[PDB]
Design a binder for this molecule. Structure first.
Ligand SMILES: CCCCCCCCCCCCCCCCCC(=O)OC[C@H](COP(=O)([O-])OCC(O)COP(=O)([O-])OC[C@@H](COC(=O)CCCCCCCCCCCCCCCCC)OC(=O)CCCCCCCCCCCCCCCCC)OC(=O)CCCCCCCCCCCCCCCCC
Ligand SMILES: CCCCCCCCCCCCCCCCCC(=O)OC[C@H](COP(=O)([O-])OCC[N+](C)(C)C)OC(=O)CCCCCCCCCCCCCCCCC
Ligand SMILES: CCCCCCCCCCCCCCCCCC(=O)OC[C@H](COP(=O)([O-])OCC[N+](C)(C)C)OC(=O)CCCCCCCCCCCCCCCCC
Ligand SMILES: CCCCCCCCCCCCCCCCCC(=O)OC[C@H](COP(=O)(O)OCCN)OC(=O)CCCCCCCCCCCCCCCCC
Ligand SMILES: CCCCCCCCCCCCCCCCCC(=O)OC[C@H](COP(=O)(O)OCCN)OC(=O)CCCCCCCCCCCCCCCCC
Ligand code: SF4
Ligand code: SF4
Ligand code: SF4
Ligand code: SF4
Ligand code: FES
Ligand SMILES: [K+]
Ligand SMILES: [Zn+2]
Lengths: 115, 129, 205, 95, 176, 263, 96, 115, 103, 209
C-alpha cells in the first residue's frame, strides 16, 4: 500500500529536473518551429504558448504523473523537430477558428443550458 | 520478494492531466453511480446486477435538414460497468469527476403462501382463481 | 510466368532483394509466404486445419533464398495449388443445409419465419439483440492469403463483443520493412513493399 | 471465337499455346441466366420427435476455464508431441 | 506435403552451357516475352461498350433501396424497426404512430445513403419484404443532400422499380 | 434458530419455514422462469413455467407455490427441469399469434425472452391457431386478447391492488377468455399498471402505441411531481423526446406502481 | 389524397407541410418537393371487404412466403369488420 | 557417418561440419551451468532430464540422418541452435531465480472474468 | 538513393474498427471484417466466424464448410492476383495487371 | 461427438495443455499466479508484471517450449479492476504445433518492461498499446504514437474514451488550413440497450453479492 513502481523519477525534486530540461528544449525549439513551418506568429507568441502549457499542470505533486507528462511532452517535441507535424498540427494550440465562448454566468445563461 | 526498488507516493491518485479530456468535460460534468432499475415491463433481474456510471444529460436539438437529433456532448452515450460501488467511486475520483452515488435498492423478502388464498376468516381469500 | 519467371530484368529486380533469415522471420512475427520464402515449413491449413482443409490435398511451396524472387514463386505456385483445391471442392461438395440448424444462433428460413411462432420470435431476437455468446476469450487464426490472420475475441456473456483485437499479418511484416531494406536503394524498397503484400485496411484497422 | 484461321495460327504461334482451346472470353458454355427454382433441403434438427433442444444445445455445454494452478520424479512434458516432419510432394517435388 | 520452387541445379554439359550462352547473348527469353504480348494484340478485347452494354448482374444484387407495397397499394412496412436495430451503420431513422385508420405505419423512414454500407441486412431482417435493395446502381448525385433519402423518396423508388424488384424476389426467395 | 437448510444445485442455503422453492432459488442468484407468479400478487400456479425437479422425487413441483422442505435439493438445471420448460413454452406458443413486428411488447417481452433462454428453437404445431375478439376497457389500455396467455396477473392485480373486481375469466378450456364480459371500462387511478404486469402485449399503452421500440429508448431515473407521494419513475426518451413514464421500484414509497396521472 | 396547403405546398401522406413563415421552404426554391402521390391509406380503403363463412380467418398477405406472417382474425363481432394488422385487408363473416 | 548435406533449407542457418562433436559440447556445458541452480529447482530437474536424454542419443547414433529422427528437432543444425538457446536460458535463470516463491499475489479480483 | 532508414508512418487509414466493434452485435460486426483486408474479404469473414463459433461451441454444417473452403481458395486467387500483378506494376511491368484483372 | 450442431471436444489436447500448464508453473513459481485451460483448449498463464521477461524468455528458449513466434500482443481495459489494463501475449510454437497465452496487468502509471529484447515483433505492438491505451513500456527502443493523429490527445481504446472523441476536423477558408474544433454530430449516435433481463448461461453464474 502506497509503495509503487516508479517510471523515471523517484521524487518530485528529481522529477522537476526533467520538467526544466524539457522546458529548455521547447524554449530553444520555438524559433526553429516558427521558421520551418512558416508560421505567421512571433517567437514570443510561441514561447508564451509553451509557458501556458507548462503552467497548466503546475499543481501536480505525483512524480509518476509528472514523468508521463514529460514523456508526452518529449513525444510532442520529437514530432515537431522532425516535421512529422504539419502547419495544421502546430496551430491547433492556438484555436484560431474557435469563437470565444462565454465565461460569466449571465453570458452562459443567454446562449444555452450548459453550466 | 518484489526486488524492484519501489518508491512512496502519499497523494491521492489523479490522472485528469494525462487522460486528454478537455477541461470542459471534467469540472462541469456530474457522474451518476447507480444500479439500474429493473425494466418494469419484464420480470427478469439480470440487468440489475452491476453498477453503472452515466453522466448528466445535455441539450439535443433537431437537425435543420432532416430533423435528426443532434448533440454537442461527447459523453452522451458513455456508460461504464463496475462490479462494486467502491470500484465505481474509485474510477470517478481519479478522473476528477464529481459524482452522486445511489445505494442499491434490493427487493425486500416477501412471505408468499398459496394457502392464504383460501383463508377461513381473513381477507386474503380470493374471489376468483 | 512467361512474362516474369525467366525474365532477366524481373530476376534482377527480385533476386537477393529483401533477404530475410529464417531465424529473424520467426522473431519479427512474420507469417505465411514471409516464413515459407525463407525455407520454414509452416502452413496453418496443414498444421492447424480448420473447416475441411484436412480433407483436401495440396502442396505448400517452400523457398530457398528468402528473397523477393522466391516469395514471388511461392505466390504463383500457391495460385496453382488453389486451382487444385477448387477441383476437389467442386467434386466433394455434399448436400444439406448451409447454416447451423440451431435457431438461437442462425436465423430461420423466411418461409418458417412467416408460419411458426418460435421461428418469428428467434428471427426477431436474432436481428434486434443478437445471440449471447458465453463468456471467454479466444485467439483464432487462419492461413489468410497474406499470412496468419486471427482475432483475439473477448466475450462477457452479452450479445456485443467486449474486446476484438485483430492480428493483421501485414502489421508485423511492415514492422520489418526497416530490417529488410538495409543496404538497398530506393527502387528496391518499392520491390520490398510489394513482396510483403501489404494492405492498410488490416495494418491500421 | 470470330478470328480467322490465319490470325488464330499467328496468335497460337506467338504464344506457344493453343489459345482457342481455352479462351478467356466466355461464350454459350456459361449457365443460363434463368434457372429452375430450387427446393433446398432441411437440417438435421427438422424433426417432429426426439428433438428436444436441451440435447443439442451447444452454447449451454460451454464451461468456464478449468483452473490448473492458482495462488489464491515427475517427467518433463511439452505442449504437445513434436510436429512430424513434412514429406516431399510426389505430385511435383521440384518446380 | 511441400515442394521446392527454386531448388534446381543447372546442367553443365557443353550443349547446356552453350544453350544458356545463346540465351544470354541473343535475348531468347526476352524475345519470348515479346511473343506473348503480340498474341494478346490479336485477341478480341474484353471491353464492353458502356453505357450501351452493361456488366452482368444477378437477382441477389444489392443496389438502391426501395420501399415496397402490397398488390393492393398498401405499404408493406409496419414500423417494426427491425431494420433500424440491425443496420450496422445506423443509417436508418424511423418514427411511427397509429395512422388515421389505426394502422401501424411510419411517419419517418430515412436512410442516410452516405452512412449505409449496402449490406442487405435490412432486407434480411424485414418480416414483410418491405425494405429491399433494388437492382439500380446508377444514382450518382451532384450534391450531398440528395443522398439523404426520406420516406417519400423511398416510396417513389419502390413504385419506380417494383416491376423489376418483384421479378428478382420471385427468382431468389426460395434460397431465402 | 427456526431456519431450515435446503440445497440449490447442492449448495446449502438457510431459509425460513414457508419459503417457496422459487424464493429459495433467489437467495443463490437463480431466477426461476415465470409468467403468472408476481411477488406482489397472490400465488396462482397456472402457467407451469416454474416447474423444477427435486432430487429423489419423480414429479416436478411448481416453484412459485411449493414450500421447501428440510433437506431438499432443488435441481434448477437438470434434464427433467429443462424438458419441462420446453414443453410448457411449446404449449404457450402453440396458439400465440405471429404479431411480434406489429406488437408493442417486442424487445421487452417475457414470452420472447424466456422462449429464447428456456424454450425450444422451432415449432411442430401443424394446426390452425386460436383467435379471440378484442375487448375495449377504456382509452388508456389497449386490448389485443389473441396475445393473452391466461396468466391472470391482471385479474389478481385488479382485485388485490386496485380493489376493482371487474376483470375475470369467462369460458372454459381453450376458449377461456380474460375480460369484463360486459362492455365496461376498467377506469381506476391504478389502471395503467396492468400494462406493466401483463407479460405479453395483450395489454399495452394506447398513448404509447407504435411510437418506439424498447431498445432505442434512454432510461432517465427521475421523480414524479403529479402528487405529493413522490413516486420514483423512469422517463423513457428517444432522440430528445419523452416517450413514456414507467414505474421504478421503491419499497418504501410506491413499490412498482404509479398512478394513471403520473403515467 | 394529395392536397395543397394555402401557400401552395403539397401535403404528404404523413400530414407534413411547411407553414407560410417557415424559412425551411427556401430549400424548394428552384427545385421540387418530393411527394408520393399514391396514399396508402386511400388505396387500402378501396379494396372490397371479403365475405367468409367461418368465425376465424387467416391472412398471409397473399403470395405465400412473399407476403407477411400468417395471422388469424376473429370475426365474431358484427358491428365492425376484422382487419389484418399487417396488410389492412378486411374480412366479414357471412350472415353472422 | 553419412554424406555431408549441401544445405539446411533454412536461410541463414549454415551447415555444421561436426554436428556430433558440437552437440556433445553444448549439452555438457548446459549440465555444468545447471549445477549452479539449487538441486530442488524444477528447472534444474527438468532441464537436466531432457538434456541427458538428448545427450544419450548423440552418443548412441553416429549417423546424422538417423540421429535427427531420434531427436525430432528438424535438421541437426536446428538442434544445435536450440542447444545454444537453452544454454543461454540457463545462464539467465540463475540471475532471475524463478524457483523463489511468488513475488506478490494479485488483487482480490484481478483474474475474475466476467466482471 | 541508398536507404539508410525506413520509418513507416501508419494510421492514415486508422478508423477505430476495434472500438466500433464493441458497440455492435456479433452479426453487426461481421461487415467490418470484409473491410480489413479488402482483397481477401471472405477469408477475413471466416476467421471471425471460426472465433465466434468456437465461443458459441457450435459447428457449421458440412456443406457450409465446403463452401467456405471453396470460396476461401477463390479468394486466395483474388488476393494473389492483386499481390503479384501490383507488385509487378510497381516494378514497371504493367501488362500482367490487365490480363489477370479480367480474371 | 455425434451431434451435428455441437462442437466436438478434443480431450487429448486438453490433458496435454493442462499438463504443460503445471510444468510452467513449477518452473516459474516466482511469477505464475494462475493457470487455466478453456473448454476449447487454449492455455492461459497469468503472471505477475515483474515476470514478463523471465516468463517469455523461458517460453521462447526452453527446449520443451520453443515458442519462437509472437502471434499478437494486445491490451484489454477493465475499469472495475484496480489494475484496469490486461496485457495479453499470444505465442506460437512451430516445433510443438501449440499455442499459449500469457497475461499480466498494470494501471495508468505503472510501467511494464518492454519485450523487444525477447521478441522483435513486440516493437510495434507495444507502440500500439501505448498509443491506444496509455500503458508505458520501459526501455522501449522508441515509444510514440503509431495509429493516432499527430498531437492527438487521449487514448481511444480506453472504455471511458467516447466513441466519437472530443475533436473533429474540417477545412477553414479564413486560415487556409485544416482546423480542429469540438465535436458536434448532425445525428447523435443512438445508444441501444440490447441486454436481455434473463440470464443466458447458468454455468457462468457468479455467486450472489
Ligand atoms: C497491315 C494490313 C492490315 C490489313 C487490314 C486488316 C484486315 O483486313 O484484317 C482482316 C482479317 C481479320 O482478322 P481477325 O482478327 O480474325 O478479325 C476478326 C473477325 O474475323 C472479323 O471481325 P468482324 O466480325 O468485326 O468483321 C467486321 C469488320 C471487319 O472489317 C474489316 O474488314 C477489317 C479491317 C480491314 C479494313 O467490319 C468493320 O468493323 C469495318 C470497320 C472497321 C475498319 C477499321 C480499319 C479500317 C482501315 C484503316 C486504314 C484506313 C487507311 O485479318 C486477316 O485475315 C489477316 C490480315 C493480314 C493480311 C492482310 C493483307 C493480306
Ligand atoms: C566463330 C568466330 C568467333 C567470333 C564470332 C562471334 C559472333 C557472335 C557475336 C556476339 C553476339 C553478341 C550479340 C549482342 C550481345 C549484346 C547483348 C548482351 O550483352 O547480353 C547480355 C545482357 C545482360 O545479360 P545478363 O543480365 O544475364 O548478365 C550478363 C553478365 N552476367 C551474367 C555475368 C551478369 O543482356 C541484355 O543486353 C539485356 C537486354 C535489355 C532488354 C532490352 C529489351 C529486349 C529487346 C529485344 C528486341 C531486340 C531487337 C534488336 C534489333 C533491332 C533492329 C533495329
Ligand atoms: C507483327 C507481325 C507478326 C510477326 C512479328 C514478329 C514477331 C517476332 C516475335 C515473336 C517471336 C515468337 C516467340 C518465340 O518463339 O521465341 C521463343 C524462342 C525460344 O525461346 P527460349 O528462351 O526457350 O530458347 C530456346 C532454345 N535455347 C534455350 C537453347 C536457346 O526464342 C528464339 O529463339 C528467338 C531467337 C531470335 C533471336 C533474335 C535476336 C537478334 C535480333 C537481330 C536483329 C533482328
Ligand atoms: C501475310 C498476308 C496474310 C496471310 C495470308 C492469309 C493466310 C492464308 C489463309 C489461311 O488462313 O490459311 C493459313 C493456314 C492457317 O490455317 P490453320 O489455323 O493452321 O488451320 C485451320 C484451323 N482452323 O496456315 C497458315 O497460317 C500458314 C502460316 C502463315 C504464313 C506465314 C505468315 C508469316 C507472317
Ligand atoms: C558443333 C557446332 C559447330 C558450329 C557452332 C558455331 C558457333 C560457335 C560458337 C559457340 C561455341 C560452340 C563451338 C565450341 C565447340 C562445341 C563442340 C564441343 O565442344 O564438343 C562437344 C563436347 C561435348 O561436350 P561434353 O563432353 O558433354 O561436356 C563438356 C566437357 N568439356 O564438348 C567437349 O567436351 C569439348 C571441350 C569443351 C570445352 C571447349 C571450350 C568451349 C568453350 C570455349 C568458348 C567457345 C565460344 C567462343 C566463341 C565466342 C563467340 C560466339
Ligand atoms: S444495406 Fe446494411 S447499412 Fe445499408 S441501410 Fe440496410 S442494413 Fe443499413
Ligand atoms: S422496413 Fe421492414 S424491418 Fe424496417 S421497420 Fe418497416 S417492416 Fe420493419
Ligand atoms: S406478446 Fe411477445 S411473443 Fe407475443 S406477439 Fe407480442 S412481442 Fe411477440
Ligand atoms: S391479459 Fe395479460 S395479464 Fe391478463 S391474463 Fe392475459 S396475459 Fe395475463
Ligand atoms: S410462475 Fe409458477 S406456475 Fe406460473
Ligand atoms: K404488457
Ligand atoms: Zn394480411
Amino acid at each position: 500500500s502506497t509503495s509503487v513502481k516508479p517510471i523515471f523519477s523517484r521524487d518530485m525534486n528529481e522529477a522537476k529536473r526533467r520538467v526544466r530540461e524539457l522546458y529548455r528544449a521547447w524554449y530553444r525549439e520555438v524559433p526553429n518551429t516558427v521558421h520551418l513551418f512558416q508560421l505567421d506568429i512571433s517567437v514570443k507568441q510561441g514561447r508564451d504558448k509553451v509557458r501556458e502549457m507548462f503552467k497548466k499542470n503546475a499543481h501536480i505533486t505525483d512524480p509518476r504523473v509528472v514523468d508521463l507528462l514529460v514523456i508526452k511532452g518529449k513525444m510532442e517535441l520529437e514530432e515537431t523537430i522532425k516535421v512529422w507535424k504539419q502547419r495544421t498540427h502546430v496551430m491547433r494550440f492556438f484555436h484560431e477558428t474557435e469563437a470565444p465562448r462565454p465565461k460569466d454566468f449571465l453570458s452562459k445563461f443567454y446562449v444555452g443550458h450548459d453550466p | 520478494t518484489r526486488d524492484t526498488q519501489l518508491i512512496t507516493v502519499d497523494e491521492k491518485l489523479d490522472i485528469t492531466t494525462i487522460t486528454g479530456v478537455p477541461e470542459e468535460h471534467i469540472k462541469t460534468r456530474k457522474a451518476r453511480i447507480f444500479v439500474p432499475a429493473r425494466n418494469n415491463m419484464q420480470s427478469g433481474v439480470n440487468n440489475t446486477k452491476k453498477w453503472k456510471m452515466e453522466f448528466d444529460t445535455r441539450e439535443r436539438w433537431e437537425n435543420p435538414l432532416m430533423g435528426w437529433a443532434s448533440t454537442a456532448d461527447p459523453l452522451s452515450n458513455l456508460v461504464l460497468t463496475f462490479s462494486t460501488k467502491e470500484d465505481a467511486v474509485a474510477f470517478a475520483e481519479k478522473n476528477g469527476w464529481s459524482y452522486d452515488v445511489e445505494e442499491r435498492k434490493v427487493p425486500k423478502p416477501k412471505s408468499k403462501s398459496y394457502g392464504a388464498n383460501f383463508s377461513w376468516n381473513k381477507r386474503t381469500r380470493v374471489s376468483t382463481k | 510466368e512467361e512474362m516474369l519467371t525467366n525474365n532477366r530484368i524481373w530476376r534482377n529486380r527480385t533476386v537477393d532483394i529483401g533477404i530475410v533469415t529464417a531465424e529473424d522471420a520467426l522473431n519479427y512475427g512474420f507469417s505465411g509466404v514471409m516464413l515459407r520464402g525463407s525455407g520454414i515449413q509452416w502452413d496453418l491449413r496443414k498444421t492447424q486445419p480448420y473447416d475441411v482443409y484436412d480433407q483436401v490435398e495440396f502442396d505448400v511451396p517452400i523457398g530457398s533464398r528468402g528473397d523477393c524472387y522466391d516469395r514471388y514463386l511461392c505466390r504463383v505456385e500457391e495460385m496453382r495449388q488453389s486451382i487444385r483445391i477448387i477441383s476437389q471442392c467442386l467434386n466433394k461438395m455434399p448436400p444439406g443445409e448451409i447454416k447451423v440448424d440451431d435457431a438461437k444462433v442462425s436465423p430461420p428460413k423466411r418461409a418458417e419465419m412467416k408460419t411458426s411462432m418460435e421461428s418469428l420470435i428467434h428471427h426477431f431476437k436474432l436481428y434486434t439483440e443478437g445471440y449471447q455468446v458465453p463468456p471467454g476469450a479466444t485467439y483464432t487464426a487462419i492461413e489468410a492469403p497474406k499470412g496468419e490472420f486471427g482475432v483475439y475475441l473477448v466475450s462477457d456473456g452479452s450479445s456485443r463483443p467486449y474486446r476484438c483485437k485483430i492480428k493483421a499479418p501485414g502489421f508485423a511484416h511492415l514492422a520489418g520493412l526497416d530490417k529488410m531494406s538495409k543496404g538497398h536503394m530506393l527502387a528496391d524498397v518499392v520491390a520490398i513493399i510489394g513482396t510483403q503484400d501489404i494492405v492498410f485496411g488490416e495494418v491500421d484497422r | 471465337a470470330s478470328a480467322t484461321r490465319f490470325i488464330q495460327w499467328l496468335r497460337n504461334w506467338a504464344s506457344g499455346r493453343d489459345l482457342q482451346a481455352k479462351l478467356q472470353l466466355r461464350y454459350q458454355e456459361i449457365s443460363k441466366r434463368t434457372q429452375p427454382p430450387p427446393k433446398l433441403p432441411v437440417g438435421p434438427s427438422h424433426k417432429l420427435s426426439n428433438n428436444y433442444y436441451c440435447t443439442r444445445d451447444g452454447r449451454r455445454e460451454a464451461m468456464p476455464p478449468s483452473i490448473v494452478m492458482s495462488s489464491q520424479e515427475k517427467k518433463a512434458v511439452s505442449p504437445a508431441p513434436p510436429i512430424k516432419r513434412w514429406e516431399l510432394s510426389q505430385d511435383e517435388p521440384y518446380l | 506435403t511441400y515442394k521446392y520452387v527454386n531448388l534446381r541445379e543447372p546442367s553443365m554439359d557443353m550443349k547446356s552451357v552453350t544453350d544458356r550462352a545463346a540465351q544470354t547473348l541473343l535475348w531468347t527469353e526476352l524475345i519470348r516475352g515479346l511473343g506473348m504480348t503480340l498474341s494478346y494484340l490479336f485477341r478480341e478485347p474484353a471491353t464492353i461498350n458502356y453505357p450501351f452494354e452493361k456488366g452482368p448482374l444477378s437477382p441477389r444484387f444489392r443496389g438502391e433501396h426501395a420501399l415496397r407495397r402490397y398488390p393492393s397499394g398498401e405499404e408493406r412496412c409496419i414500423a417494426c424497426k427491425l431494420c433500424e436495430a440491425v443496420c450496422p451503420a445506423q443509417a436508418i431513422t424511423i418514427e411511427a404512430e397509429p395512422r388515421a385508420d389505426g394502422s401501424r405505419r411510419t411517419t419517418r423512414y430515412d436512410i442516410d445513403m452516405t452512412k449505409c454500407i449496402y449490406c442487405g441486412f435490412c432486407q434480411e431482417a424485414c418480416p414483410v419484404d418491405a425494405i429491399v435493395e433494388g437492382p439500380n446502381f446508377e444514382f450518382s448525385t451532384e450534391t450531398h443532400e440528395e443522398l439523404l433519402y426520406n420516406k417519400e423518396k423511398l416510396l417513389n423508388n419502390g413504385d419506380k422499380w417494383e416491376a423489376e424488384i418483384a421479378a428478382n424476389i420471385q427468382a431468389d426467395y426460395l434460397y431465402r | 434458530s427456526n431456519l431450515i437448510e435446503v440445497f440449490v444445485d447442492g449448495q446449502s442455503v438457510m431459509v425460513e419455514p414457508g419459503t417457496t422453492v422459487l424464493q429459495a432459488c433467489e437467495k443463490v442468484g437463480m431466477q426461476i422462469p415465470r409468467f403468472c407468479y408476481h411477488e406482489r400478487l397472490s400465488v396462482a400456479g397456472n402457467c407451469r413455467m416454474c416447474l423444477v425437479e427435486i432430487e429423489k422425487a419423480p414429479k416436478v413441483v411448481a416453484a412459485c407455490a411449493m414450500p421447501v422442505m428440510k433437506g431438499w435439493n432443488i435441481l434448477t438445471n437438470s434434464e427433467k427441469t429443462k424438458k419441462a420448460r420446453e414443453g410448457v413454452m411449446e404449449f404457450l406458443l402453440a396458439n400465440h399469434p405471429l404479431d411480434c413486428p406489429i406488437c408493442d411488447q417486442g424487445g421487452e417481452c417475457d414470452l420472447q425472452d424466456q422462449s429464447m433462454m428456456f424454450g425450444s428453437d422451432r415449432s411442430r404445431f401443424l394446426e390452425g391457431k386460436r383467435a379471440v375478439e378484442d375487448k375495449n376497457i377504456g382509452p388508456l389500455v389497449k386490448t389485443i386478447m389473441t396475445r393473452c396467455i391466461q396468466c391472470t396477473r391482471c385479474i389478481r392485480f385488479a382485485s388485490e391492488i386496485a380493489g376493482v373486481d371487474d376483470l375475470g375469466t369467462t369460458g372454459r378450456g381453450n376458449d377461456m377468455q380474460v375480460g369484463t364480459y360486459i362492455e365496461k371500462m376498467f377506469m381506476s387511478e391504478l389502471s395503467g399498471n396492468i400494462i406493466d404486469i401483463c407479460p405479453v402485449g395483450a395489454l399495452t399503452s394506447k398513448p404509447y402505441a407504435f411510437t418506439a421500440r424498447p431498445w432505442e429508448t434512454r432510461k432517465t431515473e427521475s421523480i414524479d411531481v403529479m402528487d405529493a407521494v413522490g413516486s420514483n419513475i423512469v422517463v423513457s426518451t428517444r432522440t430528445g423526446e419523452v416517450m413514456r413514464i414507467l414505474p421504478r421500484m421503491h419499497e418504501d414509497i410506491n413499490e412498482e406502481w404509479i398512478s394513471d396521472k403520473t403515467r | 389524397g394529395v392536397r395543397t396547403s394555402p401557400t401552395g405546398e403539397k401535403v404528404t401522406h404523413t400530414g407534413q407541410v411547411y407553414d407560410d413563415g417557415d424559412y425551411r421552404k427556401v430549400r424548394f426554391v428552384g427545385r421540387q418537393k418530393e411527394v408520393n402521390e399514391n396514399f396508402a391509406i386511400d388505396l387500402i380503403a378501396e379494396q372490397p371487404v371479403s365475405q367468409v363463412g367461418s368465425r376465424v380467418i387467416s391472412c398471409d398477405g397473399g403470395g405465400g412466403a412473399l407476403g407477411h406472417p400468417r395471422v388469424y382474425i376473429n370475426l365474431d363481432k358484427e358491428t365492425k369488420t376484422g382487419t389484418c394488422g399487417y396488410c389492412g385487408l378486411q374480412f366479414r363473416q357471412q350472415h353472422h | 557417418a553419412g554424406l555431408l548435406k549441401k544445405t539446411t533449407g533454412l536461410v541463414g542457418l549454415a551447415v555444421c561440419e561436426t554436428p556430433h562433436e558440437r552437440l556433445k559440447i553444448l549439452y555438457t556445458k548446459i549440465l555444468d551451468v545447471l549445477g549452479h541452480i539449487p538441486k530442488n529447482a524444477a528447472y534444474r530437474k527438468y532441464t537436466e532430464q531432457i538434456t541427458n536424454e538428448k545427450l544419450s542419443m548423440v552418443k548412441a547414433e553416429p549417423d546424422v540422418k538417423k540421429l535427427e529422427e531420434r531427436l525430432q528437432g528438424g535438421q541437426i543444425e536446428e538442434v544445435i541452435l536450440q542447444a545454444e538457446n537453452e544454454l543461454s536460458l540457463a545462464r539467465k535463470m540463475i540471475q532471475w531465480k524463478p524457483w523463489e516463491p511468488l513475488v506478490e499475489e494479485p488483487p482480490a479480483s484481478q483474474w475474475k472474468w466476467p466482471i | 538513393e541508398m536507404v539508410r532508414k525506413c520509418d513507416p508512418h501508419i494510421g492514415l487509414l486508422h478508423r477505430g474498427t476495434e472500438k466500433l466493434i464493441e458497440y455492435k452485435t456479433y452479426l453487426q460486426a461481421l461487415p467490418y471484417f470484409d473491410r480489413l483486408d479488402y482483397v481477401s474479404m471472405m477469408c477475413n469473414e471466416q476467421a471471425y466466424s471460426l472465433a465466434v463459433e468456437k465461443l458459441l461451441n457450435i459447428r457449421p454444417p458440412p456443406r457450409a464448410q465446403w463452401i467456405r473452403v471453396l470460396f476461401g481458395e477463390i479468394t486466395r486467387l483474388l488476393n494473389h492476383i492483386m499481390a503479384v500483378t501490383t507488385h509487378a506494376l510497381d516494378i514497371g511491368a504493367m501488362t500482367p495487371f490487365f490480363w489477370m484483372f479480367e480474371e | 461427438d455425434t451431434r451435428p450442431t455441437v462442437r466436438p471436444r478434443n480431450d487429448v489436447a486438453h490433458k496435454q495443455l493442462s499438463a504443460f500448464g503445471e510444468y510452467v508453473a513449477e518452473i516459474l513459481p516466482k511469477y505464475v499466479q494462475q493457470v487455466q485451460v478453456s473448454c476449447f483448449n487454449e492455455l492461459e498463464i497469468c503472471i505477475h508484471p515483474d515476470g514478463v521477461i523471465p516468463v517469455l524468455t523461458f517460453l521462447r528458449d526452453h527446449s520443451n517450449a520453443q515458442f519462437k513466434s509472437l502471434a499478437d500482443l494486445t491490451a484489454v481495459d477493465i475499469p472495475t479492476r484496480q489494475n484496469r489494463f490486461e496485457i495479453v501475449y499470444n505465442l506460437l510454437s512451430l516445433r510443438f504445433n501449440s499455442r499459449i497465452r500469457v497475461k499480466t496487468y498494470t494501471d495508468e502509471l505503472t510501467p511494464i518492461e518492454s519485450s523487444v529484447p525477447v521478441y522483435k515483433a513486440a516493437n510495434w505492438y507495444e507502440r500500439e498499446i501505448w498509443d491506444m491505451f496509455g500503458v508505458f513500456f520501459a526501455n522501449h527502443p522508441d515509444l510514440r504514437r503509431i495509429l493516432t493523429d499527430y498531437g492527438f490527445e487521449g487514448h481511444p481504446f480506453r472504455k471511458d474514451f467516447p466513441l466519437s472523441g472530443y475533436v473533429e476536423l474540417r477545412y477553414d477558408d479564413e486560415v487556409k488550413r485544416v482546423v480542429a474544433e469540438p465535436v458536434e454530430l448532425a445525428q447523435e449516435f443512438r445508444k441501444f440497450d440490447l441486454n436481455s433481463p434473463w440470464e443466458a448461461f447458468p454455468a457462468y453464474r457468479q455467486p450472489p453479492e
